Nucleic acid binder design. Structure first.
Lengths: 380, 96
RNA sequence: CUUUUUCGUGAGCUGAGCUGUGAGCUAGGCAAUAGUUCUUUAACAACAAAAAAGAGCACAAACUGUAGACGACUUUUUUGCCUCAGGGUGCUGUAAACAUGAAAGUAAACUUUACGAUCUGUUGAGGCUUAUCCCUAGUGGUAAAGUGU
RNA sequence: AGCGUACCAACAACCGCAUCAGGUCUCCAAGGUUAACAGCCUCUGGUUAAAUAGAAAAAAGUAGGUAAGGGAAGUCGGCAA
RNA sequence: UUGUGUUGAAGCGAAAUACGUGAGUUUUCGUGGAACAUCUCCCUAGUGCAGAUCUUGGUGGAAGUAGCAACUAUUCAAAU
RNA sequence: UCUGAUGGAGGAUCGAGUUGAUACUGACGUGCAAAUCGUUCAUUUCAAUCACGUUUAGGGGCGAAAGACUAAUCGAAAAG
């Protein structure tokens, strides 16, 4: 018979199966729709989750209970050393999907890039990409001309530089970033002129911009149904334990449905969150990356004692409003919004008032080590 | 056939284990560490070193120990581990 | 197959001559035979032998812990990594020792000497801090080289 | 004079089909704290043995702990704590 | 009644250009190592199994699985 | 009559042990166990508890009474 009291199901069926992700790297399922009018431009970037802090900003929301008052907001730091563009891949549409026409490489690729092709680089002869790169320029131009003539989707192979990060990993994360913009004539030259040079984050993204984040969530091994799906605990008197679903299906159908929550893997899931606002794009060069015009102090984004479980951010970074899936050191792929947003939050120009760099280990009271030593005075 | 004076941080080795296993786990970790360091399967811990490790009961072994590993010729190579009584553990590193 | 020849294409030669190939022209003679059929052994692809010509990785191991019931997964293997140490960052809360130092009071000598919870100074000291914190070409080390193709 | 006189008395020597967490009568009875032959720690005496070990350490189980704010709204019932 | 056996009987395993429609019969090879048949006719019975939660014995999948969980706890070195 | 001591009565009280077995309707339920384990609980000067010896034997016994118990067997034991 019917349920005495209805209530919504537990968990979303749209994230099934809750299995382990294939890869640690976030994979873009789809890029934003191509707009012919806009000039050619990159669409995605890669960084690493360094940690998070909080900032103070002045709200400019009229008719809100906050408005003129200053607000503390949590923000994630994603270290983004410049990516290196190394390849061009052209796609053409077929009734069977997108088909690669060919990929064209640059004349030189980093050892960091070549490491990604090896499982045992240290014992290898490192012979990858050694004799396919000295191909004559005539064939290169022929391949680009055929891509121009036939292809309709262009992507640039680009890779990260983990040597510029505190990561133990040495092999680069490589991925293709789709170029959206003018015709293929313009797309090809836009990528060719950047076929070897570094790609900084500032080229891809602007401050105060909404972006999507693609990353693999934090893993938790196998978890019970109570933690995995949020089912209600059974009463204390239950004979064979209470941390389980009581009825896992009616008599008929004489099967267990796939919609029934069960124990299994929790975390390490691929996720694509939308609408994370970039609060600041901090640069490697400047010494006031974490300073605001209302603070005028000389400090960088890394909190005293370093980002816990990550290290020091010595490169470009972006301060992302809110949280992002994944642990520290997790590679986060930032993607341009699928459709540009004209909402008030999307178009808002945030004015950062203060960025906290106190120790994230324990409860830090100081913003800088100099401030700490000045406060305590001389010691033994 | 070499002698090495090294310090073991037993805190990070027994950090996870339970009360009843802290001292035996410390002993097992010293044996394993000496074996790995000297590339010998035959590792003998001195009785005095065992006494020192157990000196505070099974609950908490010392956080750090200074040990002296020595290789001896008589499958054939083996190592002997001895306790080194030190006043302080600060500023001293691995010696050969 | 032989003769007369005509027209197109390949090798080699210098738009061009020759050889071969394909089709044809004139003339000549030259073969088929297994007893009435038992599928008309006729295709395609592959393989073996013999001749002629041209032509690296992965696992394991040690490490890691962004992972984990076990597999699996993320890493590193000599600008790295592990280790200890130093520094940072924190947590706790001021260590042991000494002090004709204090201390509610007490007793014992011809004014000092004994006992004293506790307190003070040296002492924001001492201890701990990755094992899943941060920095350091700082110390020592980084092992046998097995398996599959 | 004759008979008994070893040993276990349970922890594996008894009865429970067994080298079974069960059952099975009596006497001796230290120190500290304390009302106390209680509990907890200790000396003499005994032991460090239990039908297994090592490693890892997730779900789940079982035996426990602790939980902000509320305080029986839970439940047949304040069951359990 | 009239036969077969140490030049290998009964039994057993696999079989057969075998016979029968079929219960079966008959043969071969191997193993076996001491008895066997009579269909010439008849006499006799404790005479024919797939089952009975059948009886006795043997053996499986489950499965290298459940499990080897009370009694706080073991460690170093040596001898045999 | 009132007050303070003394005194040490009671099928008096709390409470270990002993004797039991309220609850968790806990564990276990292919158990350590054909009734156990843990916590909780009842009981301790008396109608108290224990041992050995001894009596009562089956349409009988024995029962502060539950159709209880009478050798894992009881609205008629067990053996033939």
């Amino acid at each position: 018979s019917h349920r005495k009291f209805e209530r919504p199901r537990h968990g979303s069926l749209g994230f099934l199966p809750r299995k382990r992700c294939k890869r640690l790297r976030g994979k873009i399922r789809s890029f934003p729709k191509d707009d012919k009018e806009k000039p050619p431009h990159f669409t995605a970037f890669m960084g690493y989750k360094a940690g998070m802090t909080h900032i103070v900003r002045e709200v400019d929301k009229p008719g809100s209970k906050l408005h003129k008052k200053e607000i503390v907001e949590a923000c994630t730091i994603i270290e983004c050393a410049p990516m290196v563009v190394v390849g061009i891949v052209g796609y053409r549409e077929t009734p069977k999907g997108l088909r690669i026409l060919s990929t064209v490489w640059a004349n030189h690729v980093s050892d960091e890039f070549r490491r990604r092709y090896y499982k045992n680089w240290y014992k290898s002869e490192k012979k990858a990409f050694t004799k396919s790169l000295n191909v004559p320029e005539a064939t290169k131009n022929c391949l680009l001309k055929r891509i121009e003539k036939y292809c309709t989707v262009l992507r640039a192979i680009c890779h990260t530089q983990p040597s510029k990060t505190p990561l133990r990993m040495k092999k680069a994360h490589i991925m293709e970033v789709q170029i959206n913009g003018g015709s293929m004539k313009e797309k090809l030259e836009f990528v060719k002129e950047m076929l070897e040079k570094n790609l900084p984050v500032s080229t891809v993204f602007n401050p105060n911009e909404m972006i999507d984040v693609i990353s693999v969530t934090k893993g938790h091994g196998t978890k019970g149904v109570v933690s995995r799906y949020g089912v209600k605990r059974l009463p204390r008197k239950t004979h064979r334990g209470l941390r389980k679903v009581a009825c896992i299906g009616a008599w008929h159908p004489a099967r267990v449905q796939f919609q029934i929550p069960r124990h299994g893997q929790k975390g390490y899931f691929h996720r694509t969150e939308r609408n994370k606002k970039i609060y600041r794009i901090g640069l490697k060069t400047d010494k006031n990356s974490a300073s605001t015009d209302a603070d005028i102090t000389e400090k960088k984004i890394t909190p005293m004692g370093g980002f816990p479980h990550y290290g020091v951010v010595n490169e470009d970074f972006l301060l992302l409003k809110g949280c992002v899936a994944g642990t520290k050191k997790r590679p986060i792929t930032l993607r341009k919004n699928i459709v540009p947003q004209v909402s008030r939050d999307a178009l808002a120009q945030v004015s950062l008032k203060f960025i906290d760099t106190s120790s994230k280990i324990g409860h830090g009271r100081f913003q800088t080590s100099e401030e700490k030593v000045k406060y305590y005075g001389p010691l033994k | 056939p070499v002698t090495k004076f090294i310090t073991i941080n037993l805190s990070k080795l027994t950090h996870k284990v339970c009360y009843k296993r802290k001292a035996p786990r410390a002993i097992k970790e010293i044996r394993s560490i000496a074996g790995k360091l000297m590339h010998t399967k035959d590792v003998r811990l001195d009785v005095k070193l065992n006494k020192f490790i157990w000196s505070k009961g099974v609950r908490n072994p010392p956080k750090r120990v200074r040990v002296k590993l020595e290789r001896k010729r008589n499958e054939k190579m083996y190592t002997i581990v001895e306790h080194v009584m030190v006043d302080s553990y600060k500023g001293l590193v691995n010696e050969c």
